[PDB]
Amino acid sequence: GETTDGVYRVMTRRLLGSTQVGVGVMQEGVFHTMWHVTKGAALRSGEGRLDPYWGDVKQDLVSYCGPWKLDAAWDGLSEVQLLAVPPGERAKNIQTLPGIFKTKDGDIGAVALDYPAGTSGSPILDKCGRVIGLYGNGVVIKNGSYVSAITQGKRE
Amino acid sequence: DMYIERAGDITWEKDAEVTGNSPRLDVALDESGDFSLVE
Numbered sequence: 001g002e003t004t005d006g007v008y009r010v011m012t013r014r015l016l017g018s019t020q021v022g023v024g025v026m027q028e029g030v031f032h033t034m035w036h037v038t039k040g041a042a043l044r045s046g047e048g049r050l051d052p053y054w055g056d057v058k059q060d061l062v063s064y065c066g067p068w069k070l071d072a073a074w075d076g077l078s079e080v081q082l083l084a085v086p087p088g089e090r091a092k093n094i095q096t097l098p099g100i101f102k103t104k105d106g107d108i109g110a111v112a113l114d115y116p117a118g119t120s121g122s123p124i125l126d127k128c129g130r131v132i133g134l135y136g137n138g139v140v141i142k143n144g145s146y147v148s149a150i151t152q153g154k155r156e
Numbered sequence: 157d158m159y160i161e162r163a164g165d166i167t168w169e170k171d172a173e174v175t176g177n178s179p180r181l182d183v184a185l186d187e188s189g190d191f192s193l194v195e
């Protein structure tokens with residue numbers, strides 16, 4: 001199977017035609033995506049099989065073939081880039097300055113970009129191209145727009 | 157049954173479309189992973 005580092009679309013042949021349900025990152029032999037995209041289910045990569053290794057519904061994350069590898073974090077000051085991979089459209093970098101999700105357990109960066117639901121799992125990057133989290137788990141604000149958290153896992 | 161297709165490289169791109177605001181929101185994270193606005 002294709003284990004090349006990079007950004008990937010998560011597709012399904014269950015519904016009419018081929019439908020993009022999400023996006024994920026391949027890094028160091030591990031596939032990283034959001035839990036709500038696959039719901040823990042196994043993935044196909046050509047003829048190779050990707051089996052889930054770690055997952056957590058609260059964090060809304062899941063890794064395949066190995067533990068979570070992404071550990072870079074937003075510095076709190078710099079602009080970041082969402083490598084948005086929308087359904088039926090090409091990968092497109094979009095630079096934004098993140099906001100903050102103020103929670104009882106600490107603050108989290110948040111990207112205020114609006115994209116289709118199939119864009120869930122698109123990586124958020126820092127100036128050196130390191131993945132600082134995934135886009136796809138957020139909230140809808142007063143004006144109907146979508147604000148996603150910068151969801152990052154823990155590296156063991 | 158789900159499958160993956162490569163969509164590109166992970167790189168920082170100079171001169172990309174800069175857009176979007178930076179709000180400071182009050183939120184709550186539930187056991188099911190759902191974020192919500194606290195007011």
Ligand SMILES: Cc1nc([C@H]2CCCNC2)[nH]c1C(=O)Nc1ccccn1
Pocket residue numbers: 036060114115116117118119120121135136137138146148188189190191
């Ligand atoms: C289908 C779906 N389901 C969740 C939930 C995931 C687990 C609990 N918290 C919300 N978000 C979504 C979504 O549509 N996300 C999304 C991502 C980018 C752009 C637009 N929507």
